[PDB]
């Protein structure tokens, strides 16, 4: 006997050890990240983070380093970002209290609002505006932090 | 000739910061044939509507000036238009590491969603891009601290 999970873990390990990020991702796509062994969370999260379209600036800004010392929450954050579950990544970021991760998740959430088809134009616009205001607030906080550190 | 009027309307929109309106005004036209200043308008408009903080948008677009080479403007227009293959080829021609890496990542996504490619061809392409990305990442880490000596 059926142990499809057991097998996918071995399979993702084989692909990861070869840097086959995309293939790791599709191997694991039907599986809940919260129940994965820590090494498998590591493989998946690394795979998502390695393939996230970040500019050099974004890259400098966000906590996108993943190691076998990195806390589970950071791995879950990047896995949800990777799966386009920005709502889930947003509330993780807030729990973590990582400013730039909240901002990054707010940006992905903005896109999802922009594309949402169930929302009317007015509810749409209101929400984008709420988001941009929150982003600007955090951006203001980052700037003031950097100002104090240069004093 | 409606082309000329599009350039004029895109200018009218650009000067009001109506970046997304600039983009739609020019959507049908080829970027290579556009006058330098319109390439600037379009490139800037794509950058100003990317998913980035305001500060990040400023940082990229403040680097795009009317003394900037046409190539950097074409790069951003391709990115903005999801012509990531084209952005990548240009990026390698420019020989700027950062633009190659960003374009690879966006190209990866183009492949990921390409309907014409078969199941197996898609995967082999992604496998290749994935390995290249690891290679750039390994070089990134090595530059950060060479640990000599
Ligand atoms: Cl993917
Ligand atoms: Na490989
Ligand atoms: Na970083
Ligand atoms: Na500029």
Residue numbers in the entry:
A (entry chain D): 0, 241 to 390
B (entry chain A): 242 to 390
Copy the relevant paper text.
The membrane-bound EssB is an integral and essential component of the bacterial type VII secretion system that can contribute to pathogenicity. One of these is EssB, a 50-kDa bitopic integral membrane protein that is conserved among T7SS gene clusters in Firmicutes. The architecture of Geobacillus thermodenitrificans EssB has been investigated by combining crystallographic and EPR spectroscopic methods. The protein forms a dimer that straddles the cytoplasmic membrane.
A higher resolution structure of EssB-CΔ, residues Ala241 to Gln397, resulted when the flexible C terminus was omitted from the recombinant polypeptide. Approximately 75% of residues are in α helices arranged into a series of coiled-coil motifs that are predicted to extend across the cytoplasmic membrane. The structure starts at α1, with Ala241 at the transmembrane border, potentially the continuation of the helix that transcends the membrane. At the lower end of α4, a sodium:malonate ion pair is bound. The asymmetric unit of EssB-CΔ consists of four molecules, which are labeled A to D. An average rmsd value of 1.38 Å is obtained from the least-squares fit of the Cα positions of individual subunits with each other. The dimer is primarily formed by interacting residues on α1, α2, and the loop linking α4 to α5. However, with a solvation free energy gain of −14 kcal/M (estimated using PISA; Krissinel and Henrick, 2007), the dimer is predicted to be thermodynamically stable. The extracytosolic E273C showed a major distance distribution of 44 Å, compared to the value of 43 Å derived from the EssB-CΔ crystal structure, essentially confirming the assigned dimer structure and ruling out the physiologic relevance of the crystallographic dimer contained in the asymmetric unit (AD pairing) with a theoretical interspin distance of 49 Å. The topside surface exhibits two large grooves, one formed between α4 and α8 and one between the helix pair α3-α4, above the dimer interface.
